Amino acid sequence: MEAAHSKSTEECLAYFGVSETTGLTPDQVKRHLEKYGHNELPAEEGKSLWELVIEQFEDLLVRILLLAACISFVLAWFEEGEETITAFVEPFVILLILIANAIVGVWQERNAENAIEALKEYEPEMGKVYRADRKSVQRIKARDIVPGDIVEVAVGDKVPADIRILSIKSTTLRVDQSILTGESVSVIKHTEPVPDPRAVNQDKKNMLFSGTNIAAGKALGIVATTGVSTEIGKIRDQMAATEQDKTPLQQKLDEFGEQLSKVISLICVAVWLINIGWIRGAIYYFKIAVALAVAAIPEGLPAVITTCLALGTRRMAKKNAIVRSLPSVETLGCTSVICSDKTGTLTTNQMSVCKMFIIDKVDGDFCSLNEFSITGSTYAPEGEVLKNDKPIRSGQFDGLVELATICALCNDSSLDFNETKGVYEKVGEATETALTTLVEKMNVFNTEVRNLSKVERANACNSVIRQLMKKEFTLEFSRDRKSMSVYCSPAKSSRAAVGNKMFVKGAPEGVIDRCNYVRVGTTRVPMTGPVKEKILSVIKEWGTGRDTLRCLALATRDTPPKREEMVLDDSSRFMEYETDLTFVGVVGMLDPPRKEVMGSIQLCRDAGIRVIMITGDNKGTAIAICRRIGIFGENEEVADRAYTGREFDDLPLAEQREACRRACCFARVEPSHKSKIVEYLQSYDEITAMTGDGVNDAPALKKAEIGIAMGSGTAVAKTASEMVLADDNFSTIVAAVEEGRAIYNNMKQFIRYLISSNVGEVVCIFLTAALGLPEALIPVQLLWVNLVTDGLPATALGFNPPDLDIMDRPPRSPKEPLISGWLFFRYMAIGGYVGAATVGAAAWWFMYAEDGPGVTYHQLTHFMQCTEDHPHFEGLDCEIFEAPEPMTMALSVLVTIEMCNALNSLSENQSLMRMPPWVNIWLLGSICLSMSLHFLILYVDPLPMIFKLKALDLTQWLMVLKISLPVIGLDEILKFIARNYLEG
Ligand SMILES: Nc1ncnc2c1ncn2[C@@H]1O[C@H](COP(=O)(O)OP(=O)(O)OP(=O)(O)O)[C@H]2OC3(O[C@H]21)C([N+](=O)[O-])=CC(=[N+]([O-])O)C=C3[N+](=O)[O-]
Ligand SMILES: FC(F)(F)Oc1ccc2c3c([nH]c2c1)[C@@H](NCc1ccc(Br)cc1)CCC3
Numbered sequence: 003m004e005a006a007h008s009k010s011t012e013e014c015l016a017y018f019g020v021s022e023t024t025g026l027t028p029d030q031v032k033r034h035l036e037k038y039g040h041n042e043l044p045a046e047e048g049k050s051l052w053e054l055v056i057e058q059f060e061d062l063l064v065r066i067l068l069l070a071a072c073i074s075f076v077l078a079w080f081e082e083g084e085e086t087i088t089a090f091v092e093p094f095v096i097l098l099i100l101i102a103n104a105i106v107g108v109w110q111e112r113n114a115e116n117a118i119e120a121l122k123e124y125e126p127e128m129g130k131v132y133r134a135d136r137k138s139v140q141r142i143k144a145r146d147i148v149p150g151d152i153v154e155v156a157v158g159d160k161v162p163a164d165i166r167i168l169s170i171k172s173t174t175l176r177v178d179q180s181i182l183t184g185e186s187v188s189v190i191k192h193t194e195p196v197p198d199p200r201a202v203n204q205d206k207k208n209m210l211f212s213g214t215n216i217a218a219g220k221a222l223g224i225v226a227t228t229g230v231s232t233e234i235g236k237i238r239d240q241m242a243a244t245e246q247d248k249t250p251l252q253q254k255l256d257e258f259g260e261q262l263s264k265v266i267s268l269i270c271v272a273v274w275l276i277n278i279g280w281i282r283g284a285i286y287y288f289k290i291a292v293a294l295a296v297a298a299i300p301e302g303l304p305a306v307i308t309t310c311l312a313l314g315t316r317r318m319a320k321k322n323a324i325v326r327s328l329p330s331v332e333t334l335g336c337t338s339v340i341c342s343d344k345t346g347t348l349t350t351n352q353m354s355v356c357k358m359f360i361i362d363k364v365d366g367d368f369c370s371l372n373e374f375s376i377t378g379s380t381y382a383p384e385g386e387v388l389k390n391d392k393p394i395r396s397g398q399f400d401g402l403v404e405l406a407t408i409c410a411l412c413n414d415s416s417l418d419f420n421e422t423k424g425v426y427e428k429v430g431e432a433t434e435t436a437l438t439t440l441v442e443k444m445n446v447f448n449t450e451v452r453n454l455s456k457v458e459r460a461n462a463c464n465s466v467i468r469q470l471m472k473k474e475f476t477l478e479f480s481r482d483r484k485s486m487s488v489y490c491s492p493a494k495s496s497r498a499a500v501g502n503k504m505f506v507k508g509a510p511e512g513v514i515d516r517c518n519y520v521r522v523g524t525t526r527v528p529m530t531g532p533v534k535e536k537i538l539s540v541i542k543e544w545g546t547g548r549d550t551l552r553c554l555a556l557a558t559r560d561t562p563p564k565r566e567e568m569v570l571d572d573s574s575r576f577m578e579y580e581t582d583l584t585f586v587g588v589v590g591m592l593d594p595p596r597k598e599v600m601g602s603i604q605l606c607r608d609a610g611i612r613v614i615m616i617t618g619d620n621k622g623t624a625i626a627i628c629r630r631i632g633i634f635g636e637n638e639e640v641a642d643r644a645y646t647g648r649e650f651d652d653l654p655l656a657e658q659r660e661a662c663r664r665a666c667c668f669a670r671v672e673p674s675h676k677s678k679i680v681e682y683l684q685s686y687d688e689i690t691a692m693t694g695d696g697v698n699d700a701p702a703l704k705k706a707e708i709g710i711a712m713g714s715g716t717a718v719a720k721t722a723s724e725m726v727l728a729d730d731n732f733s734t735i736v737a738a739v740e741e742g743r744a745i746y747n748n749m750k751q752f753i754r755y756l757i758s759s760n761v762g763e764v765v766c767i768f769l770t771a772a773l774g775l776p777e778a779l780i781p782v783q784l785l786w787v788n789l790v791t792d793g794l795p796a797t798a799l800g801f802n803p804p805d806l807d808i809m810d811r812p813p814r815s816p817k818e819p820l821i822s823g824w825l826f827f828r829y830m831a832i833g834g835y836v837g838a839a840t841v842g843a844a845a846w847w848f849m850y851a852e853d854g855p856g857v858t859y860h861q862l863t864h865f866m867q868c869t870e871d872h873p874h875f876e877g878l879d880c881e882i883f884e885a886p887e888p889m890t891m892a893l894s895v896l897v898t899i900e901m902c903n904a905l906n907s908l909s910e911n912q913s914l915m916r917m918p919p920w921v922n923i924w925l926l927g928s929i930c931l932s933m934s935l936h937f938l939i940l941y942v943d944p945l946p947m948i949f950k951l952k953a954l955d956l957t958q959w960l961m962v963l964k965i966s967l968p969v970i971g972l973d974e975i976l977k978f979i980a981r982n983y984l985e986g
């Protein structure tokens with residue numbers, strides 16, 4: 003049933019064929035389950051495992067490795083002679099590593115997915131329905147509440163569906179629906195039809211929305227829509243699925259992927275070309291092509307990448323930064339401008355009326371004032387009211403009595419006592435509750451409150467004013483006039499002839515212009531120029547002083563219009579109905595900046611991040627706040643870097659864009675302006691973190707490259723967001739950007755470490771083919787390196803502790819190459835030394851090791867010419883070239899160097915003498931475990947037969963360290979030219 007908000011109780015009942023006492027029949031339930039599905043957000047769709055395999059097949063390197071599989075398969079098939087046929091392990095392993103990688107990408111594609119699942123969290127487990135089974139209410143699983151059944155809800159329950167209220171059983175019904183509308187005040191719900199069929203949800207005051215909770219009361223309704231049809235379920239309809247564009251790192255990695263394709267193909271052609279001058283031969287340059295493919299591809303890199311991301315996500319997630327979109331962590335390092343709202347994010351949103359003034363005397367041009375101050379900054383109703391630092395019984399001033407009345411009446415919020423926490427808490431809007439607390443502190447009628455209870459005391463004095471003036475109706479706040487008013491009539495009935503009143507509170511600018519009189523206690527004197535000046539002179543002093551107060555003016559229309567001649571259907575006339583007012587006084591409440599923000603702001607400048615503050619204060623106060631928290635200097639001229647929504651809109655398009663180039667402070671912007679500022683910032687290739695919590699903030703969060711939504715905010719903003727501030731703190735953003743920087747510098751390290759490791763293997767294979775030597779590494783050994791003995795240090799590298807200057811450098815540009823020009827030189831030379839060292843390791847055994855045959859280099863590089871007992875190969879067994887020992891020398895050198903390179907990769911440019919190995923203790927363990935797995939693979943008797951290895955003696959090991967360790971002295975020397983001859 004659509005638009006049930008416009009239909010009467012009887013109509014919705016007549017629509018579904020239900021009784022308000024009998025409920026639904028099980029037969030009706032079956033029929034509805036069929037015609038409406040269950041009451042839940044359906045499981046993820048559009049994702050096919052088989053169709054996902056196509057994406058893996060489409061990737062280039064997967065195509066290569068898949069081709070290396072079929073080759074390795076046919077090679078093991080054909081080569082029955084001179085080897086055991088139980089040697090299909092290599093093609094099998096190739097497939098498994100390919101299968102594993104497919105699983106891996108899918109496995110945490112669900113981590114990039116379920117970002118939108120943060121909305122599935124808002125629906126409840128259970129609900130209550132009256133049904134045709136029992137005369138009492140049955141508690142059903144919420145996902146089985148079909149449309150049409152009668153639902154009961156009480157205090158503190160979650161509304162389990164979208165329900166048209168049928169009959170409120172308690173006195174009144176208040177519904178917290180902030181989660182869906184942003185309404186920070188519990189809405190009064192009624193049972194009448196709201197007439198407009200397309201009215202906004204804020205007007206649907208007869209509807210219960212799923213996912214919202216009941217502030218107070220108890221009602222009975224009938225389910226109008228379930229699951230997706232609900233307004234909270236309408237949020238899932240977009241379901242992302244927008245244009246998906248590769249991240250900059252994803253794009254760069256793929257360019258390396260194809261340069262790797264070119265390089266493999268060329269080497270493959272070169273060795274087929276070098277061999278100048280058959281079945282046994284067709285084997286060779288296919289075997290090495292497999293050895294080539296396996297040696298070039300990092301194999302385990304996606305596993306390491308998606309792991310260090312997951313652990314970084316949880317690191318950030320415990321710093322109150324909830325990463326929805328995973329590509330964000332890359333983007334977070336490139337953040338050039340954070341643009342955030344003031345209230346609740348730069349400040350505590352913990353309101354307290356700090357100062358207030360009424361008029362003292364008026365003589366001609368002169369106008370004195372009675373200024374008051376109030377101790378206590380919590381919502382607790384405790385503290386003095388001060389005049390000249392001394393206590394004052396507020397009720398002695400008739401001007402304060404009227405101020406207290408206006409505050410208590412121009413108010414839709416209240417105070418509550420949390421029985422468990424033992425503290426006073428905010429009900430409804432924070433800025434209104436500040437007035438509630440102020441009234442209780444003033445106590446203008448000297449209501450006896452001492453012997454009350456912590457609960458009763460919360461609203462005693464507010465209730466006393468409610469006992470005097472009966473709030474007939476309210477004139478809602480509009481932004482054109484920046485004020486609201488309430489029409490009240492006397493309720494004592496014993497007291498006579500007071501008359502109907504209208505109490506107006508609003509921004510001092512507009513309210514004061516619509517005043518014609520100033521109340522002096524109980525007397526009335528017309529509004530004059532000299533007095534209005536002194537009023538604004540203190541309002542401006544307060545909103546610009548060291549305490550930076552938002553100010554509110556309180557007024558009264560002494561003679562309101564005829565209640566039967568006011569038309570409440572159109573806001574446009576509301577301002578006129580608040581004319582001929584009498585200025586009563588002004589309250590000034592503080593909302594102090596969070597302890598951290600001043601320092602957190604400083605970091606953004608040190609790191610080259612511009613901070614734009616969007617706020618609703620006046621341009622005067624907005625500028626002042628920016629000096630207080632440090633966006634501007636106290637003595638700096640900020641004329642050109644602070645704008646208002648109307649000022650900004652006055653500039654032509656060209657002058658608009660130049661403003662965002664330099665601006666840092668926006669006051670009172672329309673909703674559309676956030677999205678317009680982002681567009682302008684994009685025109686300068688600036689990468690923006692933009693914050694929002696409200697329902698209108700959605701498009702500027704989809705548009706911003708890093709949409710940041712508030713944890714206490716609406717559901718829609720969270721959905722359009724890339725990240726969520728669980729603690730609402732602005733410093734959580736800075737900490738998020740900082741962490742996002744460290745992670746990329748660590749991804750860069752293990753990317754280089756793994757790929758430079760790959761280079762050494764490609765060199766080793768290439769020399770073997772070029773020199774005609776026997777194979778020194780076989781693909782099974784390489785995969786064990788590129789997946790295990792390298793993967794563990796590669797991961798632990800991602801935990802390299804951040805640089806000390808990490809927040810003293812400009813944002814990384816999105817086009818920043820993975821390697822500089824010189825890094826290409828450094829890693830080629832190391833990958834070269836790694837290639838030569840592994841081949842020489844095996845050659846040393848064949849020619850010089852005591853256990854080895856001690857053959858000559860001509861013999862060794864013609865080892866396949868050992869057809870029979872040759873005169874050339876005198877005293878040798880042909881098989882000695884297939885011996886496990888030379889391979890195990892090479893693999894042991896490849897492993898040991900990659901442990902040393904891991905120690906080198908601890909820093910891109912720092913010596914190990916300055917930043918020692920134990921700086922990353924997680925990395926030491928990764929090396930201890932990789933080496934352990936190497937001794938395991940040599941010593942547990944199923945394993946050596948597989949990988950074709952044999953345990954080295956003490957001599958052969960000391961030869962590995964003889965060979966391997968200099969790679970440290972090589973990189974240390976290479977790191978020297980960097981920090982001493984390249985930058986200067
Ligand atoms: N586009 C705008 N043009 C003009 N003023 C704007 C605009 N947007 C917001 N304001 C005013 O600024 C006040 C608080 O803004 P501020 O807390 O700085 O930031 P926001 O709460 O708007 O943003 P956030 O909640 O953090 O997303 C609001 O209080 C009030 O009017 C609102 C308000 N209200 O929002 O309901 C009621 C009120 N009385 O008296 O009822 C007085 C306000 N006031 O004096 O500012
Ligand atoms: F060895 C397998 F083929 F099985 O696994 C891999 C290992 C590494 C890569 C690489 C790619 N496909 C691979 C597939 C290519 N793009 C896939 C990819 C893109 C971004 C991220 Br993050 C991870 C992988 C480009 C080089 C890196």
Ligand SMILES: [K+]
Pocket residue numbers: 703704705706707708709724
């Ligand atoms: K976005």
